[PDB]
Design a protein around this ligand. Structure first.
Ligand SMILES: *[C@@H]1O[C@H](CO)[C@@H](O[C@@H]2O[C@H](CO)[C@@H](O[C@@H]3O[C@H](CO[C@H]4O[C@H](CO[C@H]5O[C@H](CO)[C@@H](O)[C@H](O)[C@@H]5O[C@H]5O[C@H](CO)[C@@H](O)[C@H](O)[C@@H]5O)[C@@H](O)[C@H](O[C@H]5O[C@H](CO)[C@@H](O)[C@H](O)[C@@H]5O)[C@@H]4O)[C@@H](O)[C@H](O[C@H]4O[C@H](CO)[C@@H](O)[C@H](O)[C@@H]4O[C@@H]4O[C@H](CO)[C@@H](O)[C@H](O)[C@@H]4O[C@@H]4O[C@H](CO)[C@@H](O)[C@H](O)[C@@H]4O)[C@@H]3O)[C@H](O)[C@H]2NC(C)=O)[C@H](O)[C@H]1NC(C)=O
Ligand SMILES: CCCCCCCC/C=C/CCCCCCCC(=O)O[C@H](COC(=O)CCCCCCCCCCCCCCC)COP(=O)([O-])OCC[N+](C)(C)C
Ligand SMILES: CCCCCCCC(=O)OC[C@H](COP(=O)(O)O[C@@H]1[C@H](O)[C@H](O)[C@@H](OP(=O)(O)O)[C@H](OP(=O)(O)O)[C@H]1O)OC(=O)CCCCCCC
Ligand SMILES: CCCCCCCC(=O)OC[C@H](COP(=O)(O)O[C@@H]1[C@H](O)[C@H](O)[C@@H](OP(=O)(O)O)[C@H](OP(=O)(O)O)[C@H]1O)OC(=O)CCCCCCC
Ligand SMILES: *[C@@H]1O[C@H](CO)[C@@H](O[C@@H]2O[C@H](CO)[C@@H](O)[C@H](O)[C@H]2NC(C)=O)[C@H](O)[C@H]1NC(C)=O
Ligand SMILES: CCOC(=O)c1cncn1[C@H](C)c1ccccc1
Ligand SMILES: CCOC(=O)c1cncn1[C@H](C)c1ccccc1
Ligand SMILES: [Cl-]
Ligand SMILES: [Cl-]
Ligand SMILES: [Cl-]
Lengths: 349, 340, 332, 349, 340
């Protein structure tokens, strides 16, 4: 065991981990790839998302060349704190965890030529700005940017280990999304400018499309059924004033409750989503049914309905309202047409 | 006594290299594992995880720690674990975890004369399991705990359950208010990544959700509301205000029942088994309200113009008095046979 | 300084990795506990918070010294220099020592080697609650502690004369419970790493009834009485009695969900569930009573059903209350 | 530069921070004052309050006398960990925060005579037991007690830096209270006795009066409007049975929602508050107005109302109920009297 | 060359006293501050705080760190920051803050040949700002970050914004869903305590709340319910069940609008601008219901015994059809002109 102890002691003898490899000679080049063990839940309200990654970095350090019985030294993570490692950080990250249960989830491997492999298990919570105009039929490209914190591009550059598309790999079973589909990821590289210099940024965009199923069940279907319910009153006799008024008022109250409760999980944006438009038109149809009956009630001459016995020639009885007869067709027809237009508009975006 | 023990223990750590695993550059070190489960709590469908407290014991041999002349298993103060190599075990699906630290770090190191190390930790981990809720609340979930070496491949480390099927204890003493642990099992396998092949131990439980809570909170309130919507079938057809108020209220009540249930669950896009029932009860109370509108329209809309008769208003009411209780029983018969 | 010389001599050659009497006898540790407050009982998580001054006393012959000074009164600085037992709380969900403004720990060493170690702790302790009699339920919430690594052949704990002391209970954060009494026990628990001496304190707690009387019992009772107003309304008022009957049922549905909102989603029937469900039966039957009366008089002794319901319904609810309250307040 | 390094090196050379100053020779005296930079929110649910302070402590340590070109050494808070400091803890303190951003928010100052000034910035969460029988018109004296954890009164005694009243100072712009007023503070000192000895405890009581405005808007006014709404039905004709039934049922159900929504702010205490009594009496008035109509309906003979043309000979028509006429006066008067007695009972006290 | 850098850095830290500020015992050390604001979010009216993420740069000269022979600016591993003196900068209104720590501590050290130190930290801070909600949701808030030295008075340290008004960047790119940053202001002053005068830098943002959300959530539902209540004026006086049910529900629907709004805000003892509207809209629906009770009382109470006429109920109803819409628009005119 002294053979490998003497190698490690020799490597760290006179080693200054405050200095990056090649400091004053060349640019340190860090090869990076990401293995996504789980693409975590997306939070609309916080405009963020969670991602669990094996974050891998590889760079060359000529101070760590060795010759021995082995060609790769697989060491525990406490050796990583003894040498220089890149100061990578996530530009859009919010509160990230480098897991250390039961030990720091890091691996350090040194090959005989000085190449280092340094991976760590991370849980990154990153910002994903969202445009919710098309909500709940919206799609987002959630970014994951990272780079060196202190070293400018004249000192440290990052490159993808393989073809850039193949350097971010998502696990087959690793999906913690509940209402989104991960459609893929685009991987790019760039340069950012700060008050302290120019920095290399490695970018990944995760393309997520929202799954509309929840909002159909909880918002769209209750709205459609309330609108259908409000039009049931067109088939009641015009003398059922307390009955048809309860139809109109209750459906408006239900639409108010649906409208208010439908933005609970969203950020309080100043624009109208696609769902706000749907609830508005559903509100308008429901509101207009009560206005329709009030018009019908305004031309009800008699307070008593047909008794079921007397012939009605053409005592006297009210006739079936012409406004009702037209409403029994126009209201169901205009709502069916609106749904055809509404769903063709957003399901095609 | 204590002079010899202190001399011996100091001898073990002199020249010890914590950077090298046992048998470094040689055969893999075999690490056995026992888990004594203290409790399971906060099984959250909202967060898709469960919280687990356990005593996580690891067993391995480090011949650098063999000592002689002391017929004792040396339980040392747990801070000595910072001076010893220990396996870099981690939980792959672990969202958040900690080692308890009152009154000291809940950690144990016990040496044995031949160099064997017993290393126990008291860990509370919030591990993720994604739950398939299509049969909720009659669903049966399966939540696991992946145990892996991070940096050591199968060439360097080997995992096994110590005691085989008896490696995990305390499962029969867990009380989950909403679930019953039907079964637990232990799996040993290797997992391949881009950096190597790593040993994995997997512990999984099968949680069968209890249904009694949902009978009182969601099923019985829905059945009673659906039954009370049938009262309008016995109300006189003239009483339009009474039957519309009865009809509207039950439709409103079904939404209120659904909103209370809606607010305590994640936003999954599919229809759950509880949604199928509530939608079914909604159709029944909606059709009862549509039944009066049909009765009202037949008497007043078509009366002056002049399987149920469809022209006799009282015939439709008599028909609905039979079909609605019969069909709802048929609906409950089908729904419960499919899900129980 | 003479105290400096004594402190340096004690720690010279001292190995705080080794328990005192490591190969001779078990270390006997005497434990005291002063309860500053038993915090809230969290029924949903099945846990309670407790703030204690936890005191431990043992003997370390390596800490003997001879001088005119009879005891060394020390702060937390030396706590990590000597050996300390690895006491932990076995049902602790989450525990934390205190660190403001400094580590709230005390160390006192006597010339015969006796060590007194005290620290302030806040513990979220697991307490499995059987809520069948809720909200008339009683619990004995435990607090178990033992050594994490040292078995019964190495560490033995022992309650002192004044084992557990409680201060002004009126300042405690027990909103819904009243502290009744405590017991302290000792036992040996066999684990896979050996036999361990486990010390327990049981805090008996009785739930105070007042909140749920205001929150649930009175509202549910009033909705039941509300449904009886229908019996005095004219049977010809079909919309009045149908709306009255059906809105009480809707309201009783809303009260049912509120009553269980503070509980874990246990799948058995508590005393609260029984009361709410029976009140549901009463409001349900009142609507069915009028539907039967309306059908047999208009949509056609049964005609006098209102007079019977005016007596039978108040009497049946009084009778149910008499059985319900007697069984859950004096019976099992 | 090295002149001051040698002073600091000399001060700590042979210094034992395990021993309090004057050990075996005198009682260590610690002067204390608190500057409250903000008086944070009071949590009724947790029965606790937050307070952000500059916790200043001062004591003499002859081991730290020095002679140099300065009379006060204004040192890095790293130095405070090398010397003995009081082990002050808050007796009623819950989870408190020592601020560490961007560095430990502590200052240490050593004067040439050995006097030390040691202040720190703390977020203190302290228990405040509350007696909520008068809620929402309750007042509280939230305590803040502190003292040595380890040193008995024969070893460490605390005193206030200035006159006790002037030793706890609250910043003018620091009020973070939303539903309370900080009337003032009372500053005292005493002895607490434990099983381990007698300890000096320093006490400050902050006097807080709840501001009733939120509960007037959200609880009292909806209750009063509900009671007023229920007495409106006394003015409708006795033949509007569905209309006057909806009046009674709606207001009774509204009071049920008000009662349940009223305690959401409070901890679930087992006694009745002043708000509970107001809601209970409002419930009685609303319930009685419905019981009044049932009595009116019990004496209503004819199912039809006055036709607007026939002269009532004082077919036949029902008369206006005497119960209705009496209730039009009695109910507003008794409820007006109750409000006078209720508010004078609690606002005056 | 790399050996020369290692030797040079070792020489700087040999004999370096981290307990002493630069120019200890002499003129105050001037510290320049830049902030690049990464994001502002979680502006909470409930908690009376906002969360701010920023790159926080401090600039000062430490002559003990001057080095020659290396024509480079030394960027060193951030762990070297624990061996150097840095200002004891703190935020007074800071409630909860942290320096980000993935993958390493988000900290920058860059030495310069003349001894200048650039010390950068990526910080997320939750600072407190009490909000005057009297005009909520048509309110402008002013939330600040108070930067101060804890232990060093103006005799030991001086703060200044490095770059004047260009010291803080990234404010113009901040996008908050509910707010628009009207302006930001930089202030440098001194604050006196009992322990001395301390430098303070204040960074303040003026936040204007977007009202588009509240139109959809609160105002429009309230407006529509109020308009709905006017339908009663077109119903005959004798239809008590219809007009009462219409009047009662609109009064209730106003409560439903208010309770949802109440639940998401702190216990505020004063009347907000949103409260004035809801209480204004509640008066209109209440008076519309009281209008019918007055109409019912005139016909049925004062009828048999024998500005509108106040004796013809039709006149009162027709008067209401004009006055109530007209007054409500007048109320909207006064409300929206006063709060805009
Ligand atoms: C995964 O990674 C995470 C990190 O990412 C890791 O968490 C870290 O875990 C380690 C332990 O493994 C922690 O380190 C120890 O913490 C001990 C106390 O922990 C409590 O307090 C924490 C904050 O402590 C501050 O305040 C106390 C006093 O109040 C002070 O002693 C500390 O130094 C520290 O002060 C700094 O910060 C404050 C502001 O906060 C400043 O004001 C101050 O100026 C200074 O800068 C707190 O964070 C902890 O909460 C965490 O942990 C608990 C569980 O414990 C958990 O419930 C929480 O949720 C949370 O996670 C906790 O409340 C501390 O005592 C230890 O320090 C010892 O030992 C070190 C050894 O190197 C030594 O350097 C110290 O000086 C000190 O020596 C001790 O001190 C004893 C007390 O005084 C004394 O009895 C001893 O005798 C000895 O005394 C001195 O000894 C020296 C020689 O050593 C001698 O010269 C002196 O004269 C004297 O005799 C140690 O720091 C670390 O805090 C955790 N960090 C975080 C962020 O949580 C986690 O464990 C990892 N997991 C796994 C599985 O690997
Ligand atoms: C059938 C008949 C029945 C009859 C029954 C009769 C029963 C009657 C029962 C009446 C009971 C009345 C009880 C009132 C108790 C108030 C206690 C108190 O001090 O409150 C205060 C108000 O607190 C607030 O928040 C103010 C609330 C404003 C409400 C505006 C309503 C606008 C209505 C418009 C209507 C328009 C109509 C138009 C019509 C055309 C509390 O605050 P403060 O302590 O003073 O403040 C101290 C701090 N500062 C601010 C001073 C520094
Ligand atoms: C806010 C908007 C206000 C708009 C107000 C618009 C109001 C408006 O225009 O009312 C007129 C009429 C009323 O219709 P409705 O059939 O309900 O009313 C009949 C109508 O008044 C006849 O004239 C009456 O016969 P008569 O000669 O008196 O013997 C008949 O008396 P009786 O048989 O009961 O004895 C009444 O019942 O409606 C239309 O013509 C429908 C137009 C298309 C409507 C399209 C709607 C989508
Ligand atoms: C909780 C239980 C409470 C039970 C309360 C029981 C209260 C109780 O017993 O009231 C009876 C009486 C009913 O009077 P009210 O005016 O409502 O009823 C009239 C009364 O019955 C006349 O006698 C009838 O005339 P007649 O002679 O038949 O020609 C008249 O019929 P019509 O002329 O319209 O055709 C009825 O309308 O009330 C009082 O006198 C008010 C005193 C204050 C009562 C205050 C009660 C709160
Ligand atoms: C806690 O345990 C102690 C023993 O460790 C109990 O004290 C004993 O009480 C009995 C009462 O009959 C005496 O006979 C013993 O002499 C006591 N033992 C002592 C003082 O060491 C104490 O009662 C227990 N507390 C409980 C059960 O609440
Ligand atoms: C045609 C089926 O529609 C419905 O069941 C329906 C429409 N509006 C409301 N509901 C019910 C209450 C529901 C909504 C969402 C989930 C479960 C149940
Ligand atoms: C005449 C004043 O009463 C009311 O405004 C009133 C009474 N019950 C309910 N409300 C309204 C809905 C309200 C209450 C509180 C805040 C905002 C709006
Ligand atoms: Cl998701
Ligand atoms: Cl409690
Ligand atoms: Cl407050």
């Amino acid at each position: 065991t002294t053979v490998f102890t003497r190698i490690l002691d020799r490597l760290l003898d006179g080693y200054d981990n405050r200095l990056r490899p090649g400091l004053g000679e060349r640019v340190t080049e860090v090869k990076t790839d990401i293995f996504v063990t789980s693409f975590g839940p997306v939070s609309d309200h916080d405009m963020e998302y969670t991602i669990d990654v094996f974050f891998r970095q590889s760079w060359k350090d000529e101070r760590l060349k060795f010759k021995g019985p082995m060609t790769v030294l697989r060491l525990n993570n406490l050796m990583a704190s003894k040498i220089w490692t890149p100061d990578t950080f996530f530009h859009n990250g919010k509160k990230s965890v480098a897991h250390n249960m039961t030990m720091p989830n890091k691996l350090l491997r040194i090959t005989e030529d000085g190449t280092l492999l340094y991976t760590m298990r991370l849980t990154v919570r990153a910002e994903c700005p969202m445009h919710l105009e098309d909500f709940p039929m919206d799609a987002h490209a959630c970014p994951l940017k990272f780079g060196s914190y202190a070293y400018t591009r004249a000192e440290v550059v990052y490159e993808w280990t393989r073809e850039p598309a193949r350097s971010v790999v998502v696990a087959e079973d690793g999906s913690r999304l509940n209402q989104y589909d991960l459609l893929g990821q685009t991987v790019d590289s760039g340069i950012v400018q700060s008050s302290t210099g120019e920095y290399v940024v490695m970018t990944t965009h995760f393309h997520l499309k929202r799954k509309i199923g929840y909002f159909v069940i909880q918002t769209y279907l209750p709205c459609i059924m309330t609108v259908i319910l409000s039009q049931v009153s067109f088939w009641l006799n015009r003398e059922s004033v307390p009955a048809r008024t309860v139809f109109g008022v209750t459906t408006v109250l239900t639409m108010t409750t649906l409208s208010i409760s439908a933005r609970n999980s969203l950020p309080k944006v100043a624009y109208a989503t696609a769902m706000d438009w749907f609830i508005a038109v559903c509100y308008a149809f429901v509101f207009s049914a009560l206005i329709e009956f009030a018009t019908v009630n305004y031309f009800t001459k008699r307070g008593y309905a047909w008794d079921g016995k007397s012939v009605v020639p053409e005592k006297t009885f009210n006739s079936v309202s012409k406004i009702d007869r037209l409403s029994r067709i126009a209201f169901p027809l205009l709502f069916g047409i609106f749904n055809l237009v509404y769903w063709a508009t957003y399901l095609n975006r | 006594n204590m002079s010899f023990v202190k001399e011996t223990v100091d001898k073990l750590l002199k020249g010890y290299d914590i950077r090298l695993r046992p048998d470094f550059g040689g055969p893999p070190v075999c690490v056995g594992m026992n888990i004594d489960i203290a409790s399971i709590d906060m099984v959250s469908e909202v967060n898709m995880d469960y919280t687990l407290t356990m005593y996580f014991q690891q067993y391995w041999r480090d011949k650098r720690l063999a000592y002689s002349g002391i017929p004792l298993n040396l339980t040392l103060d747990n801070r000595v674990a910072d001076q010893l190599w220990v396996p870099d075990t981690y939980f792959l699906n672990d969202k958040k975890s900690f080692v308890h630290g009152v009154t000291v770090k809940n950690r144990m190191i016990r040496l044995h004369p031949d160099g064997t190390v017993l290393y126990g930790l008291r860990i509370t981990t919030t591990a993720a399991c994604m739950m398939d809720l299509r049969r909720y609340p009659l669903d049966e979930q399966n939540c696991t705990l992946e145990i892996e070496s991070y940096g050591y491949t199968t060439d360097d480390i080997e995992f096994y359950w110590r005691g085989g099927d008896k490696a995990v204890t305390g499962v029969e003493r867990i009380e989950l208010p909403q679930f019953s642990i039907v079964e637990h099992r232990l799996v040993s396998r290797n997992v391949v990544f881009a950096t190597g092949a790593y040993p994995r131990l997997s512990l999984s439980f099968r949680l069968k959700r209890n249904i009694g809570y949902f009978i009182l909170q969601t099923y019985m309130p829905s059945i009673l509301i659906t039954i009370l919507s049938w009262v309008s079938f016995w109300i006189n057809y003239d009483a339009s205000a009474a039957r519309v108020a009865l009809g509207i209220t039950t439709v409103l009540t079904m939404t209120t029942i659904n909103t209370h249930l809606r607010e305590t669950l994640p936003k999954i896009p599919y229809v759950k088994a509880i949604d199928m029932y509530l939608m079914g009860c909604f159709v029944f109370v909606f059709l009862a309200l549509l039944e009066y509108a049909f009765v009202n329209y037949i008497f007043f809309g078509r009366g002056p113009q002049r399987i149920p008769d469809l022209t006799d208003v009282n015939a439709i009411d008599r028909w609905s008095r039979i079909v609605f209780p019969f069909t709802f029983s048929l609906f409950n018969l089908v729904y419960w046979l499919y899900y129980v | 300084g003479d105290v400096t010389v004594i402190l340096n001599n004690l720690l010279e050659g001292y190995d705080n990795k080794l328990r005192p009497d490591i190969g001779v006898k078990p270390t006997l540790i005497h434990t005291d506990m002063y309860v500053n407050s038993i915090g809230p009982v969290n029924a949903i998580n099945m846990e309670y918070t407790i703030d204690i001054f936890f005191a431990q006393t043992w003997y370390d012959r390596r800490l003997k010294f001879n001088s005119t000074i009879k005891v060394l009164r020390l702060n937390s600085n030396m706590v990590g220099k000597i050996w300390i037992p690895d006491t932990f709380f076995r049902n602790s969900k989450k525990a934390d020592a205190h660190w403001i403004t400094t580590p709230n720990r005390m160390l006192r060493i006597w010339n015969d080697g006796r060590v007194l170690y005290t620290l302030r702790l806040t513990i979220d302790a697991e307490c499995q609650l059987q809520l069948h009699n809720f909200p008339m339920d009683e619990h004995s919430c435990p607090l178990e502690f033992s050594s994490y690594g040292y078995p019964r052949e190495e560490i033995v704990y022992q309650w002192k004369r004044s084992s557990v002391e409680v201060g002004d209970t009126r300042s405690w954060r027990l909103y819904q419970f009243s502290f009744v009494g405590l017991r302290n026990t000792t036992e040996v628990v066999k684990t896979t790493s050996g036999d361990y001496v486990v010390m327990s304190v049981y805090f008996d707690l009785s739930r105070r009834m007042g909140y749920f009387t205001i929150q649930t019992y009175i509202p549910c009772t009033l909705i039941v009485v509300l449904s009886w107003v229908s019996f005095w309304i004219n049977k010809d008022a079909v919309p009045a009695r149908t709306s009255l009957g059906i809105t009480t049922v809707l309201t009783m549905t809303t009260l049912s969900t509120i009553a269980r909102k503070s509980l874990p989603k246990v799948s058995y029937v508590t005393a609260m569930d029984l009361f709410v469900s029976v009140c549901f039966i009463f409001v349900f039957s009142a609507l069915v009573e009028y539907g039967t009366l309306h059908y047999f008089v208009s949509n056609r002794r049964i005609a006098k059903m209102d007079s019977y319901a005016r007596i039978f319904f108040p009497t049946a609810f009084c009778l149910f209350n008499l059985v319900y309250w007697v069984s859950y307040l004096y019976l099992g």
